[PDB]
Amino acid sequence: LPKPSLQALPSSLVPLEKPVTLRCQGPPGVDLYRLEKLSSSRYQDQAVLFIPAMKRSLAGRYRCSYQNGSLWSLPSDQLELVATGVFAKPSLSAQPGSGGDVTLQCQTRYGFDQFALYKEGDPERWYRASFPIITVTAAHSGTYRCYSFSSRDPYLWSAPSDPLELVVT
Amino acid sequence: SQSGPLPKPSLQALPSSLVPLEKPVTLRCQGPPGVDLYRLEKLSSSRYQDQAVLFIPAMKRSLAGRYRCSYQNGSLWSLPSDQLELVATGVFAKPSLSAQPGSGGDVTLQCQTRYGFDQFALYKEGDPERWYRASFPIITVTAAHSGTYRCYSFSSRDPYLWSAPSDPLELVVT
Amino acid sequence: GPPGPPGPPGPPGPP
Amino acid sequence: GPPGPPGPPGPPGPP
Amino acid sequence: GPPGPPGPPGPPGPP
Ligand SMILES: *[C@@H]1O[C@H](CO)[C@@H](O)[C@H](O)[C@H]1NC(C)=O
Ligand SMILES: *[C@@H]1O[C@H](CO)[C@@H](O)[C@H](O)[C@H]1NC(C)=O
Ligand SMILES: [Cl-]
Ligand SMILES: [Cl-]
């Protein structure tokens, strides 16, 4: 019995106090939907959860599934719901690297041991590291930002850096 | 208006939750005083009753399994009880328990049985009783209490259908 | 009338 | 009267 | 009649 999809809308990265809606979606006509948060192991018998204002406590892993007749579906892929703006934004810079390689620096005060960098676009390009230094191989011009967080709580992220408007030759 | 969920009742099998075939057992659900309705159920079946007490005068293979209960106040259901595991005993010839003391504080016991069972359960008498489960007929026990040990064999296909208990073995540490 | 049957089991847990 | 509807599904299983 | 009680825990998840 095929798994549903679980989406966060408009996004699974959610600034504190901003809204998000989790939506489980299987076949039509089904009897019941079950949405769960994993860490706290609390759950609901409905397909949709509206979060009017994002909180530290709602960030975490979620999944869902549905039941038709008396039979359970395979569970959705896991949804990583992240709260952003829990810390001051970091500051992003870029330098050359070897060949077509660009080296970015995501600089921050607090001891953070995780960093996430992305290029705006369709689709988005994502990069990660534990050191605040991120190589982009064969980098494309674009609008870059980074986030810093702790592996002690990998679902609470900083505000995004101010965008870096990169042009590569 | 109410602060939280109604506390779960207890669920108990007297005289034991290990019940030899054809012997009596009584499952009793107990919540606080003033319960409107008790519900006692058997998991993975459609079987349940709206009564606190189930008296089984003669234990059967078909009544072995997981039970739980809860109670109702108005139309509100309590948290469910801990799951009672009702074991039908004496379904198979008893194993023969042997024991080989080890060289440094350990005792290896053996639940011998003429079949292909894959599960064995060893225990010492007198609450607190001490249990040990293994997928293999050899079972090593560290810092073993002196006492009276017995064992049971069974198959993970019907893990509530257990052998008769082995004859007791009397362990003495010094 | 008397209360309905027990609900069915929840779904299988996660990995 | 007649018996009520089934209860809701149980919690998710453990890991 | 009123609804039955919530069902039990689902089984364990894959290890
Ligand atoms: C749900 O159950 C009905 C039968 O009760 C079945 O015919 C229908 O196709 C099912 N729908 C899905 C999406 O599985
Ligand atoms: C039932 O609820 C009432 C209040 O609504 C309370 O007075 C009474 O103690 C309850 N009984 C039980 C057994 O929960
Ligand atoms: Cl984004
Ligand atoms: Cl016991």
Paired tokens of A56: 């530290």
Q: What is the DSSP letter of B44?
A: T
How many CA atoms, within 13 angstroms, populate the side-chain half-sphere of residue A42?
5
What approach was used to elucidate this structure?
X-ray
Task: Say if residue B33 is preceded by a cis peptide, omega within 30 of 0.
Answer: no
Contact E9 D9 (CB under 8 A): no
* Distances, alpha carbon A93 to alpha carbons A97, A106, A161, A164, in Å: 13, 7, 10, 7
Helices (H), chain B: none
Paired tokens of B152: 């049971």
Query: How far is the C-alpha of E3 from the C-alpha of C4, rounded, in Å?
Result: 5
Query: Does residue B6's CB lie within 6 angstroms of at least one atom of ligand 2?
Result: yes
The length of chain C is 15
Contact E3 B43 (CB under 8 A): no
- Closest chain E residue to B70 measured between Cα atoms? E5
Contact with chain A for residue C10, Cβ under 8 A: yes
Contact B39 E5 (CB under 8 A): yes
CA of B81 to the centre of ligand 2 (A): 18
Query: Does residue A30's CB lie within 6 angstroms of at least one atom of ligand 1?
Result: yes
Query: Does residue A2's CB lie within 6 angstroms of at least one atom of ligand 1?
Result: no
Query: How far is the C-alpha of B128 from the C-alpha of A41, rounded, in Å?
Result: 32
Query: Does residue A29's CB lie within 6 angstroms of at least one atom of ligand 1?
Result: yes
Mutate to test the pocket of ligand 1, among A68, A70, A72, A73 (most ligand atoms within 8 A of CB): A68
Point out the ligand nearest to the CA of residue B162.
Answer: 4
Contact E5 B70 (CB under 8 A): yes
Query: How far is the C-alpha of B23 from the C-alpha of D3, rounded, in Å?
Result: 33
Cβ atoms within 10 Å, residue B53: 12
User: Measured between beta carbons, which residues in chain D are less than 8 angstroms from residue C13?
Assistant: 12-15
Full 3-state SS string of B102-114: CCCCEEEEEEECC
- Closest chain D residue to E7 measured between Cα atoms? D10
Contact A67 C8 (CB under 8 A): yes
Cα-Cα end-to-end distance for chain B: 61
Query: How far is the C-alpha of B50 from the C-alpha of B29, rounded, in Å?
Result: 11
* Spatial CA neighbour of B48 closest among B56, B60, B59, B40: B40
Task: State how far residue D9 is from chain C, nearest Cα, in angstroms.
Answer: 5
Helix (H, G, I), strand (E, B) or coil at B61: helix
Neighbours of chain B (3+ CB pairs under 8 A): C, E
List the domains of chain B with CATH numbers: 1-89 (2.60.40.10), 90-174 (2.60.40.10)
Say how far residue C6 (Cα) sits from the centre of its chain: 6
* Spatial CA neighbour of C3 closest among D1, A53, A31: D1
Full 3-state SS string of chain A: CCCCEEEEECCCEEECCCCEEEEEECCCCCCEEEEEECCCCEEECCCEEEECCCCHHHCEEEEEEEEECCEECCCCCCEEEEEECCCCCCEEEEEECCCCCEEEEEECCCCCCEEEEEECCCCCEEEEECCCEEEECCCCCEEEEEEEEECCEEEEECCCCCCEEECCC
Paired tokens of B22: 């054809």
Cβ atoms within 10 Å, residue B105: 11
Q: Are B20 and B59 in contact (CB under 8 A)?
A: yes
* Spatial CA neighbour of B107 closest among B156, B164, B160, B147: B147
The reported resolution of this PDB entry, expressed in Å, is: 2.5
Query: How far is the C-alpha of A157 from the C-alpha of A110, rounded, in Å?
Result: 12
D4's torsion region: left (phi>0), alpha (psi -120 to 50) or beta?
A: beta
